Amino acid sequence: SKYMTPMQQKLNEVYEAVKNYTDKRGRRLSAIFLRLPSRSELPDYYLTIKKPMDMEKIRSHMMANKYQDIDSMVEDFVMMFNNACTYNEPESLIYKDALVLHKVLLETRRDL
Ligand SMILES: CCC(CC)Cc1ccn2c1[nH]c(=O)c1c(Cl)cccc12
């Protein structure tokens, strides 16, 4: 079944909060995180990041009704932002944006 159950609808609220967040200047910080480059495009990422994750993969898992609870999805987002902060250096834009969204995610969960 394709219909979103009540649990999926709650997961999708959290997913949308992260996806649609804009910073104080209107910048959509999620955009870079939708799609990780493939193994052929960025092989060194797959050497050191043991569990590659992007928001397309999370969303597909969510839409397939494969998350058992809100916490399971939050853990994949947390993994994704930790991966970004590991592969990318602290001076980088993506590292800074991963921190902001990681906090948005945690506060969204706490207030749910
Ligand atoms: C911006 C400099 C790019 C340097 C190749 C890094 C780059 C390009 C896209 N993505 C990343 N780094 C990520 O870690 C990452 C993650 Cl978690 C999820 C989805 C996309 C990602």
Side-chain angles (χ1 to χ4, degrees):
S1 173
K2 305 148 209 89
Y3 294 98
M4 295 293 270
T5 62
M7 178 57 78
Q8 285 171 294
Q9 291 189 302
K10 294 204 182 184
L11 288 155
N12 202 19
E13 287 182 16
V14 172
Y15 177 89
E16 290 287 298
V18 177
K19 184 176 123 277
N20 299 319
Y21 179 77
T22 55
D23 82 352
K24 66 176 189 162
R25 295 171 67 265
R27 191 161 62 87
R28 197 150 208 256
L29 306 184
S30 65
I32 201 163
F33 298 97
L34 271 286
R35 190 171 300 157
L36 189 67
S38 70
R39 296 168 179 278
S40 296
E41 298 177 304
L42 198 72
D44 89 310
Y45 192 94
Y46 292 83
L47 287 176
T48 54
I49 305 291
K50 304 310 184 67
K51 295 180 168 179
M53 191 57 64
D54 64 23
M55 286 178 65
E56 280 182 338
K57 182 176 169 185
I58 293 172
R59 190 188 67 215
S60 297
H61 205 251
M62 167 186 67
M63 271 169 204
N65 202 12
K66 298 173 326 199
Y67 287 119
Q68 297 303 305
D69 54 40
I70 303 294
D71 287 345
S72 191
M73 182 178 83
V74 173
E75 291 291 351
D76 283 347
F77 272 106
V78 165
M79 175 78 70
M80 184 184 77
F81 296 132
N82 289 340
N83 290 344
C85 290
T86 304
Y87 180 81
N88 301 283
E89 55 271 49
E91 296 71 27
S92 67
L93 189 63
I94 191 178
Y95 173 107
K96 295 173 197 210
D97 294 349
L99 288 167
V100 168
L101 288 178
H102 188 155
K103 191 57 65 171
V104 169
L105 170 85
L106 299 171
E107 292 179 16
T108 303
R109 173 64 184 115
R110 181 193 64 203
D111 295 348
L112 207 65

